[PDB]
Symmetry: C11
Subunit: 178 residues, 11 copies
């Protein structure tokens, strides 16, 4: 099962080679600072290891503070996320979540907690190689990214989008799996 599977030579070789790849400009985004968006990291991990080849859990989440300054809330929240592969290999790291200025205590806490968990997951997956987000920390890679042409955001083709719940091929394979 999970945590018991040992990587075969072919799969080990494919993943080890693939994880060295640096990410193209399609993955990187910027704010006012470069970063990779959460769903992109999720999709990267799902493609690298399979939907059932990686796992993550929240070891502990701790609210550092909730302060009130003339009607505005300032909240800091840390989270400890541990990623595990289907072979037992694991990486655990710290994420943080901040919410300053909001008037809603509850919305501030929601933003801070969710942000902390997502950040922790990104930083835990980072430790597997450049393909999962390590290259973003290399300043030479950032410069080589700035010299690249700023391409416009690609468009998504919703023609083959999932339109009904049923997955007939999946149901067939699962019925044949028993």
């Amino acid at each position: 099962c999970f945590g018991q599977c040992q990587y075969t030579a072919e799969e080990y070789q494919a993943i080890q080679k693939a994880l060295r790849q640096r990410l193209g400009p399609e993955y990187i985004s910027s704010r006012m600072v470069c970063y990779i968006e959460g769903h992109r990291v999720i999709n990267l991990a799902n493609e690298m290891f399979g939907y059932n080849g990686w796992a993550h859990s929240i070891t502990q989440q701790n609210v550092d503070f909730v302060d009130l300054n003339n009607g505005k809330f300032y909240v800091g929240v840390c989270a400890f996320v541990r990623v595990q592969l289907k072979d037992g290999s694991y990486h655990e790291d710290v994420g943080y979540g901040v919410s300053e200025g909001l008037k809603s205590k509850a919305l501030s806490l929601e933003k801070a907690r969710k942000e902390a968990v997502t950040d922790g997951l990104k930083r835990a997956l980072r430790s597997f190689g450049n393909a999962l987000g390590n290259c973003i920390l290399d300043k030479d890679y950032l410069r080589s990214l700035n010299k690249l042409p700023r391409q416009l955001p690609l468009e998504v083709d919703l023609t083959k989008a999932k339109r009904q719940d049923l997955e007939p091929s999946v149901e067939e394979a699962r019925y044949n799996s028993c």
Copy 2:
């Protein structure tokens, strides 16, 4: 049993391909936020049915690791409640994803309904955010702004109608009863 079943090549490959699909406009809904901005989301029951179809009714599981009420404040007769929950989804092979949901209830005068609303919302949100990590088909694509742009350019479709003619009308499931009798 559960957590021990190992995925066969056919089911693994089918699921891996199927999870890449982004969701059509049938799944996505929208509300208005505190900044007057549009926020998309998938309704709970849609995600539950999506997961039941992707993994089988017995191929996925979820549990509440911890639910914690952050605060209960009383402002001139109105209750403001924040509740977080940690939901862990597991597949029949032991693979798991755990995330946090939050639940908010501001303005209500009934403390009990505020707490109920916050707790249930927190748990459902945590389940959705935990299931997100399995792929676009279970809700990962909703975070892609390009997917959102491609969704607005689409015609606002009218609510589909449900045909309740073959709806279940009595408890017994005879084919199910036979299949189970033959299992003992």
Copy 3:
């Protein structure tokens, strides 16, 4: 034993198909839920019988992970009580779904009746919300507003009558007793 048996292909397919079924109007009832509007729901005993038919009396299980009384407040002689419960349903293959229920009692003068109402409602609500996660047939469809529109357009049927002629009248079960004697 329980939690160890793996579903056979025939029973898996039967149950997966049956769980997709939406519920007819015989199951749906209405009360005034949280929010003060008319809200549809499935009665507890109906969900119990639904689950017993879907999985068998020994094919599903549930337990109360934790029940916590959030508060008991007294406002000029009336009691206001909120109670949450965490109920986890498990199938005979180890598959599980856990959710939160809440129980409310505001205004009553009897503390004991208020607490009893809140605790029992919390447990039953948690069980229903945990069973929701297996498919439409166990209560997931009730959350689809399109399903509600398709339910209102249906002819309002009168409550069916129960024929108590073949009702159980003595304790002994000879058919069961024989199979059990031969099972040892």
Copy 4:
């Protein structure tokens, strides 16, 4: 041993069939509730014997997960006590159902007797509500509003008589001792 035995096809089907039965009027009793209304219920010993017949003396089990005294109040010499209990019933195959019972005692001048009544009543109620989840035959049908009306239309029968001629009069059980000696 217990929790390990798997139900055989014959015993499973027999029990699944028997549990669908609604109960005849011999089981149901009634009192006058709060608002000058009628409320039906099944007495504890009836449910105990029903379970012993359905599963065998060694085919079902129950335990008290937790009992918590909610309150003990003193108003001018009278004690008012509320007690909840969490009872978990388990079958010989590991299947389980857990629910909450409550126990109330208002008016008594003895704190000890109030607590005794409340605790025992809570536990018995919890056992009844836990056994309810196995099917109609163990008490689920009592929740059906149509079933109660269909029960009122039957002629109210007078208490059947019990013939104590074959009552056990001395301790020794020779057939049991013989089979048990043959068990070694």
Copy 5:
């Protein structure tokens, strides 16, 4: 060992039949309750002997899960003590039943004797109520009001006399010592 032995068909059926037996008048005793009314009961030693005969000296077991002193109050020189106990009986196959006993001592001037009486009574009562759940032969029939009337209609027999001629008079048990020597 204990909790592992599985009941053989003959012993299962013998015990299942024997537990249906209602108890004769030799077992029932009576005291007066608070409202000056008759309350029936089975004495502790009677239940112990019944259980030893039904299952064997090594076929049933009981343990005190938890005992909690609810209160010890002093009212003008008299002590009033209430004590609850949770007793769990288990059979040699792992089957179990757990229930609550209570112990009361009101009026005594000695705290120590009040506590002793309350604790011991709680434990014994809990054992009786746990054994009750196996069937009429172990004490369930005492709860049937119809069974009680048929007991009043019976002639109250004078206390049976005990023939102490075959009483054990010295420690050695040669047949037992021999059977055990042959076990090594």
Copy 6:
């Protein structure tokens, strides 16, 4: 080892029969209660010897689950102490019986003697009450009022004399040493 050995048919039946025996007058002792009534009991060493002969020196065991000093009060220079103990007896097949003992010391001026008396008495009483549950031969019959009447009508026998001619006089046990040397 202990707790695993399963009783052989011969030893089971021998012990089951022997435990039914009531005790002769050699075992019973008496003290006086204040109301002019007589209270019977079996002395500690007598119960220990009874158990050693019934089960063997290595066929029964007991342990102190918990001992709790309820109170130690000082009233005008005199100490009044109540102590409870929970003793669990276990047989070599895993069968067990657990009960409560109490120990009392009122009036003594030495706190140390009060505590020692109460603790030791509690433990011994708990052992007696736990062993009682195995049958009449180990002390259950002492609670039967008819057995008490049949005991009082018997001629008061003079204290038996002990023949110390074959008493153990030196440490070495040669037969035991030889049997154990062959056991390695």
Copy 7:
């Protein structure tokens, strides 16, 4: 190893026979209680050697489950200390007996010496009372008043003399060392 070895028939019967023996006057010692009455007891080392001979140096074991200092009081320069200990003896077959010992120290000016005396006495007394439960040969007979009377009528023998001619004078044990070298 220890706790797993099962007693062989020869050793079981030999030990069972030997444990029935009462002790001669060589073992019994006496002091005067605080009320001028005669109190018998067995010295610690005598009981230790008794157990070593009955079961072997490696056939019995004991451990201190818990030691609790009940009180340490200071009255005009003198310390009064009560300490209880719970000692559990176990045989190589898993059989066990647990009892309580007490240790007292009144009058001493040194708190440390008082505590040392009380703790050591509590533990030794607990070991004696735990070993008592194995039979008369290990100290059970000391509680029989008839044995005490038969002890008084026996001639009080003068303290035996110890022959230190065959005493161990150097550390080395050549026979033991040889038997052990052949054991590897």
Copy 8:
């Protein structure tokens, strides 16, 4: 699985030799301390990639045993935060090294960013110091003063340029998917 793999002779020897290598100037960075002096270090991503190449992406793992915030102080509008972390790295053969990292933030006006900086720095520092213990190739050589001197004498090379032509541009990994499909 992980923690079970034993290093093969070829892989052990390869890694043992490779870890002896000291690092070239491409890895080392430097800053100025609070007292105007040069401090060398290895950046986090370099250590992560070094370890991934030395042991494989699945041949090393690390976990946070505990993170403890030492202090958060507010001095006239500036926050000073010290946080320690204990990081444990493990290899696929069970070999492990655990060390401490620290995180500092002095002067900042935002508490949230101070805490984020201190916690993340503590964890990364602990990871670097834990990996340091495996050899020079993973960072031990940075502590050799002679290695630092021999590094300064080297020509300061210009920052290398990165060729992003072969960068990953889409999610799909066909070779990886193929090998994994062949792994089921």
Copy 9:
């Protein structure tokens, strides 16, 4: 390994015989207690060597279950410390003996030395009292007053001198290294 080995017949009997031996005057020492009385004891190292020869350096073991400082008092400039320790000796067959030692230091002005003395003495005393329980050869006879009288009648011998000519002078143990190399 340790705790698992079962004693072979030869070594068992050798040790069983050897443990009966009383100790010659070379082992016994004496001090003067507070009442000017002669108190006998065996020095620690002698008991350690006794055990090392009786069971082998690897045939017995001891551990400190708990050490508890009873008090540390400061009375007019001097420290008075009492410390108890619970030492459990175990043999290579799993047999064990646990007892309490005490350590005292009264009068010293340095707290640190008082604590050191009390703790170390408590541990050593506990080890001596635990080893005593195996038989006379390890110190049980020292408690026999008859043994003490038989010790006084012997001539007080002068301290034996130790021959340090064949003393160990370098670390290496060549025969040991050879035997160990041949064990791998």
Copy 10:
């Protein structure tokens, strides 16, 4: 895996011989203590490399059992911090050594840097002292005063130069990667 491997004769003998070697002056360093004196020590990275060469990168491991900050004092604006750490080193055969390290930081005005220095120094010192216990080669000889005098009499060598020509300049390890590919 780790903790399971048994040392082969060749590797055992090699390591046992190698650990006796004392360290040359290349390893030893010196500082000035509080009395203007010479204190010798081995720098951390040297000890890490020593252990990695003696046992292999995967043949030794260490963990931090506990680190405890003893004190943080503020004396006229400067911080003085003492921190202890407990480091446990384990070999691939399960052999282990645990010792204490300390860390000090006096004079700094930054609390965070003081704590960082003290914690890191404590952990490194504990690792050095734990590895010391394996033999002279890992640092035990540094405690021999004769070793120190014989160290002064040797010619003080110039700091060796480091040859960075073959330093690792890129991440990939082709020999390691190939040896690992052949291991799956």
Copy 11:
């Protein structure tokens, strides 16, 4: 592995013989202890080397069960610190010895140095006293007063000189690496 290996006859006998050896004057040193006179002791590194030679680098292990700082007191600028530690030594066969060490620092002005001295001394002292229990060769004889007298009569030899010609000069151990390479 460690804790599982059983000693072979040859190695057991060699080690048992070697442990009897008393130590020559090369090992013994003298300082001013808590008795206020010339007190003999074995230096830490000597005991470590003794153990490494007696059992092998991988044949003995020790751990710190607990270290507890008893007190830190400040008297006119000087610190008085007492620290105890519990060290447990174990051999490769599971045999173990656990004892207490103490560490003292009185008079020093630096709190950090006092705590460091006390903790390290406590751990080292505990290790020495735990190793004492294995025989004279590891330090038991140092307590023998006759051994001390026989040590004074020996010629006081001058500090031995160490031959550092074959001192270890580089990290690599080629023979060790070869023996390990062939072990995989």
